[PDB]
Amino acid sequence: KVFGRCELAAAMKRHGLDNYRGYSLGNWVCAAKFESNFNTQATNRNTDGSTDYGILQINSRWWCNDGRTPGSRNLCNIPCSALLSSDITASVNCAKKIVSDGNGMNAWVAWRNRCKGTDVQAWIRGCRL
Ligand SMILES: [Cl-]
Ligand SMILES: [Cl-]
Ligand SMILES: [Cl-]
Ligand SMILES: [Cl-]
Ligand code: NA
């Protein structure tokens, strides 16, 4: 599913991402924009053989099981395919664990390089929140 911007903001808010670990909702919408262009079916293969999945491009090296990343972890205890669903619950629950790891949202390369330090509230402007 390709979410509209406000549609994604509302789903992320409802699932408790807004201000999670101190990251305002605009940070999460911006991260999703540049990680997946709001497409839940986005995938990208990494050089090491792991794959990133879903709206927040969560990596199989640590966070989900895809059965094709030998020696990897599954810290969110989910199949990576669950991160491609139209329902973002699994992606949100897993992103909460990722952001709680020591580097916060710097875990998302696109957030660090394209969102961090910018006017992130503009990503939720106009939305009825
Ligand atoms: Cl914000
Ligand atoms: Cl695996
Ligand atoms: Cl949803
Ligand atoms: Cl932080
Ligand atoms: Na894995």
Walkthrough of the structure:
This protein has 4 helices and 3 strands; from the N terminus they run H-H-E-E-E-H-H. A hairpin with a 4-residue loop joins strand 2 (51-53) and strand 3 (58-59). It has a single domain, classed as Orthogonal Bundle (Lysozyme). A 3-stranded antiparallel β-sheet has the order 1-2-3. By secondary structure, the protein is mostly helical. The protein is globular. It binds chloride ion (4 copies) and sodium ion. One chloride ion (CL) is lined by residues 11, 87-88.
Which secondary-structure class do the elements indicate?
mainly alpha
Radius of gyration: 14 Å
Q: Which descriptor suits the 3D outline?
A: globular
In terms of DSSP E residues, the strand content is 5-15%
Q: Which fold name fills CATH's third level, the topology?
A: Lysozyme
Oligomerization? monomer
CATH class: Mainly Alpha
Number of strands: 3
Instruction: Please count the helical segments.
Output: 4
Query: What can be said about the biggest beta sheet?
Result: 3 strands, antiparallel
Q: N-to-C terminal Cα separation, in Å?
A: 22 Å
* Strand/helix succession: HHEEEHH
The CATH architecture comes to Orthogonal Bundle
PDB class: hydrolase
Keywords: Nucleation, phasing, lanthanide complexes, Tb-Xo4, Crystallophore, hydrolase
Assembly: monomeric
Entry title: Crystal structure of Hen Egg-White Lysozyme co-crystallized in presence of 100 mM Tb-Xo4
